[PDB]
Design a protein around this ligand. Structure first.
Ligand code: ZN
Ligand code: ZN
Ligand code: ZN
Length: 572
């Protein structure tokens, strides 16, 4: 019970017993906390409570040191010192932002803003507090017990009365009782077990609430600039394919950490793997939050790096099928491909952290904690989608508050920018260039003349809160009869329930914008479904239309985003 103060580091015996993370606070900082918030319980070796029998005064502002023990006003002896005096709380070795972080419920955008604009030690406190609150909220939702099993991909669920019903999408992963992790999709519900188990009638599902480990490492190690490439040895014989990136690879080697903003299809993955080929002896750990982002780096490595120096690290509690062509769990291979949550304790010459828009400060810290590296490279795009904030319901989280890397990218700018989109027809590139990239994204491809927009509000129905627009799906169905080439299109919409209906009426493969990110398709059909904040979010809209290599059809509800699309308008 003798640690360091989360605000000024000063050693102390005092934690805050009201904070859910119980942070060590120094005498000066502990006072400024307890006098300004509803937080009054101060723990030490013993708690700061009235030592008098039966007395229930725990508020430190109402307590005194009577010799060696603690008493309230009613029980203190004549010779006693008030625990709160001259801006201090009595303890051994004798904050506005900290107070907002410590007391907020994380339902408001301003909470996240302050967790990303505060000091570095307060970013870790914020990250721990948020994640603990997120997990304790999971305990609040109602248990689902199996009433009857229809098929191998359908059952009917009995929901706990009194406790709310969680959103039934891919985002909410349940644990069966352990018969493995299970997900659900909309009385018939589609059940997807990570284990093919005969789901017995009477078995129940709960959202797995995990213990939040404390953070120690910063989100971002302190920046060091070097005059020469440090601890890395470049090739001279370097493949013409990666000639464009060489000046940026020499920037990576001349700084402790670097930021790469790579808009869609600009060569992020190419940049990541080309770093290995430019420093052929350097040990590189490839990390991202999702298995899909780590698999994508694996696929690009399989093509350019020797397969006997690559390992795919898989946690023994396997959640979804991931990359199978590398040696599994060989922690010591020159090239290690691992999700942030599964990272081992190791060192590296270079750490490459991919899809940085999806990373939380919690993740940024866990990386700096498990990996000690000569160089850290952060790759992604603050104009693409952040991790879902399940507690955030009031206000939108702007890109500059996604995490510490995105904040640097949006304030001082990224160290390196991939400026040329090679995936998308120019109609899409020009639209997103103006929308989110300040006219700095350039199109390699010509206009395809296969990018179309239709303004059609249709009719919005709701599967609980998830939205459906049957007319917008109807307009698409009529388009498909006249446009046979599009028969191979991926259907994209901001809503699972819109996609479930699109799948039955159209038979097209189906993707939410969020699940589409990092993917590409020749033809995309996008139905905006609604004019909500969710469906009008410029990041989500940017990701939606930059999935397409050849054609896109956008059935829009929002006049603003419709008018911004530099697409051929359709009638009907
Ligand atoms: Zn302090
Ligand atoms: Zn507190
Ligand atoms: Zn008392």
């Amino acid at each position: 019970a003798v640690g360091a103060c989360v605000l000024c580091n000063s050693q102390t015996s005092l934690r805050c017993g009201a904070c859910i993370r119980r942070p060590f606070l120094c005498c000066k900082c502990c006072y400024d906390h307890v006098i300004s918030t509803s937080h009054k319980l101060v723990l030490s070796v013993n708690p700061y409570v009235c030592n008098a029998p039966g007395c229930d005064v725990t508020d430190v502002t109402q307590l005194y040191l009577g010799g060696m023990s603690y008493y309230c006003k009613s029980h203190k002896p004549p010779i006693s010192f008030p625990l709160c005096a001259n801006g201090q709380v009595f303890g051994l070795y004798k904050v506005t932002d900290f107070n907002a972080i410590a007391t907020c419920d994380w339902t408001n955008a301003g909470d996240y803003i302050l967790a990303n604009t505060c000091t570095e030690r307060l970013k870790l406190f914020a990250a721990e507090t948020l994640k603990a609150t997120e997990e304790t909220f999971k305990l609040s939702y109602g248990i689902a017990t199996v009433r009857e099993v229809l098929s191998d991909r359908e059952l009917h669920l009995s929901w706990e009365v009194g406790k709310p019903r969680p959103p039934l999408n891919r985002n909410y992963v349940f644990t069966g009782y352990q018969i493995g992790e299970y997900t659900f999709e909309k009385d018939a519900v589609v059940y997807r077990g990570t284990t093919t188990y005969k789901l017995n009638v009477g078995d129940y599902f709960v959202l797995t609430s995990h213990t939040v480990m404390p953070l120690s490492a910063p989100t971002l190690v302190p920046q060091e600039h070097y005059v020469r490439i440090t601890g890395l040895y470049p090739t001279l014989n370097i493949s013409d394919e990666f000639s464009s990136n060489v000046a940026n690879y020499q920037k990576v080697g001349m700084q402790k950490y670097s930021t790469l903003q790579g808009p869609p299809g600009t060569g992020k993955s190419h940049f990541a793997i080309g770093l290995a080929l430019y420093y052929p002896s350097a040990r590189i750990v490839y990390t991202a939050c999702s298995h899909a982002a780590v698999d994508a780096l694996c696929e690009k490595a399989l093509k350019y790096l020797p397969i006997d120096k690559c390992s795919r690290i898989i946690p023994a509690r396997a959640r979804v099928e991931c990359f199978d062509k590398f040696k599994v769990n060989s922690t010591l291979e020159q090239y290690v491909f691992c999700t942030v949550n599964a990272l081992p304790e190791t060192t590296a010459d270079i750490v490459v952290f991919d899809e940085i828009s999806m990373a939380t400060n919690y993740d940024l810290s866990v990386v700096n904690a498990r990996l000690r590296a000569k160089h850290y490279v952060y790759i992604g795009d603050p104009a693409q989608l952040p991790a879902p904030r399940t507690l955030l319901t009031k206000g939108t989280l702007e890109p500059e508050y996604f995490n510490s890397v995105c904040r640097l990218m949006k304030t001082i700018g990224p160290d390196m920018f991939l400026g040329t989109c090679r995936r998308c027809p120019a109609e899409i590139v020009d639209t997103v260039s103006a929308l989110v990239y300040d006219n700095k994204l350039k199109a390699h491809k010509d206009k395809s003349a296969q990018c179309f927009k239709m303004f059609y509000k249709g009719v919005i129905t709701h599967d609980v809160s998830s939205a459906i627009n049957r007319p917008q799906i109807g307009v698409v169905r009529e388009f498909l009869t006249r446009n046979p080439a599009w028969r191979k299109a991926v259907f994209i919409s901001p809503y699972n329930s819109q996609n479930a209906v699109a799948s039955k009426i159209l038979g097209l493969p189906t993707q939410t914008v969020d699940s589409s990110q990092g993917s590409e398709y020749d033809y995309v059909i996008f139905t905006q479904t609604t004019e909500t904040a969710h469906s009008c979010n410029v990041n989500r809209f940017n990701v939606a239309i930059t999935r397409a290599k050849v054609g896109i059809l956008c059935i829009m509800s929002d006049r603003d985003l419709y008018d911004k699309l530099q697409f051929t308008s359709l009638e009907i």
